[PDB]
Design a protein around this ligand. Structure first.
Ligand SMILES: CC[C@H](C)Nc1cc(C(=O)N[C@@H](Cc2ccccc2)[C@H](O)[C@H]2CCCN2)cc(S(C)(=O)=O)n1
Length: 393
């Protein structure tokens, strides 16, 4: 049967890109103050710029909102890159291209920050969509999505389609382009092809999952599966790269280098620091391998796999001389805090955060970048034993 899209109001409500973030328009306060907010499934605080900053064109003005409530408490939030400090409060919030509801939510008014805001990113705040366990200052600060579900009839689920262009976008092109969809309270069947396969959410803090096998061009990386989830594996729209635990990163890059060995790349490229360029239209996608991550299934002893292409893990960037060449950075990097399935991997898939059923669904995205010979894939089932042992304690 033909797939129908039943959430037209929310389709195409995101803008942005993997390197700077995907954001949604929101309003806060009375009268409403419009702000662009980065969608982050890897944190749990809703926070907005609330004081002048060289990189902000607008910010939340609490003194102009008649519905503002002061919680008289400070908050500090550190991330992998950047940190900020602010003042807690509550106010009415709406999502113009979202459900037609207004809710009262906790808002951290950012007063000081370091390496958080990004010049020309067009966003002024962050929407932490994960669970209260990781909220700052503590788990008593109800996150936005928990408030939304508690105060309305919106189902306890959201889904994300992050759309990478496959080429660089400047600030003006980002403003004029659709970056994807955040469907609040449902699944839009126009956003994916094939079937949705679900992995259990291991624990409700981050969106934690369990990886049970890793392949590079079908070749098993052959590590003990606990290594892939050391000390956790999470799905994170607020991180650019696919981040892997140090030992896994070292094995994966050795395997990716071996598969792409018909061309030699500098160490700076593999460390994700240096771009590489090819003459216009000549990027040799076929020399780079596909990467498959097998995820624990919902059925006992069953797994499924998601497969990404180099069009996902090679992030388009502009040249140092803005030439006609096609340039990229390697968007796989090391981590000391476990695996992070970041925006570059999410760009291949439609991802369903089914909080109600404690599971995350993946399907091939209708907007993923590919070539005439290969596409991203979500396939299953595979018989996989002792998958619970892949989880790190
Ligand atoms: C998608 C666009 C953002 C700007 N790119 C990022 C953000 C972070 C980060 O700390 N994300 C934060 C959120 C954030 C967004 C924008 C700016 C700063 C931080 C997120 O909450 C993480 C922290 C730990 C678990 N989830 C890390 C990386 S990395 C390591 O790939 O270089 N890339």
């Amino acid at each position: 049967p033909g797939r129908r899209g039943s959430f037209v109001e929310m389709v195409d409500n995101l803008r942005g890109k993997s390197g700077q973030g995907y954001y949604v328009e929101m309003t806060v306060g009375s009268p409403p103050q419009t702000l662009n907010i980065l969608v982050d499934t890897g944190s749990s605080n809703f926070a907005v710029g609330a004081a002048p900053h060289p990189f902000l064109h607008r910010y939340y003005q609490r003194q102009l909102s008649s519905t503002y409530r002061d919680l008289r408490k400070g908050v500090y939030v550190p991330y992998t890159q950047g940190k900020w400090e602010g003042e807690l409060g509550t106010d009415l919030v709406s999502i113009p291209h979202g459900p037609n509801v207004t809710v009262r939510a906790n808002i951290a008014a950012i007063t000081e920050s370091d390496k958080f805001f990004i010049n020309g990113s067009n966003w002024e705040g962050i929407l932490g969509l994960a669970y209260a366990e990781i909220a700052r200052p503590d788990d008593s600060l109800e996150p936005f999505f928990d408030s939304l579900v508690k105060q309305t009839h919106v189902p306890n689920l959201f889904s994300l389609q992050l759309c990478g262009a496959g080429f660089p976008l400047n600030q003006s092109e980002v403003l004029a382009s659709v970056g994807g969809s955040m469907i609040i309270g449902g699944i839009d069947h126009s956003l994916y092809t094939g079937s949705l396969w679900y992995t259990p959410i291991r624990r409700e803090w981050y969106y934690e999952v369990i990886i049970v096998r890793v392949e590079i061009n079908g070749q098993d990386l052959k590590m003990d599966c606990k290594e892939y989830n050391y000390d956790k594996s999470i799905v994170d729209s607020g991180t650019t790269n696919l981040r892997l635990p140090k030992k896994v990163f070292e094995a994966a890059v050795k395997s990716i280098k071996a598969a792409s060995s018909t061309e030699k790349f500098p160490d700076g490229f593999w460390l994700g620091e240096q771009l590489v360029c090819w003459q216009a239209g000549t990027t040799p996608w076929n020399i780079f391998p596909v990467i498959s991550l097998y995820l624990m299934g919902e059925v006992t002893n069953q797994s499924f796999r998601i497969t990404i292409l180099p069009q996902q893990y090679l992030r388009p960037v502009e040249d140092v001389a803005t030439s006609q060449d096609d340039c990229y950075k390697f968007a796989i990097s090391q981590s000391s805090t476990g695996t992070v399935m970041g925006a570059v991997i999410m760009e291949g898939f439609y991802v369903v955060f089914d909080r109600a059923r404690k599971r995350i669904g993946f399907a091939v995205s209708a907007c993923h970048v590919h070539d005439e010979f290969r596409t991203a894939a979500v396939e299953g089932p595979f018989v996989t034993l002792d998958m619970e042992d892949c989880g790190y304690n």
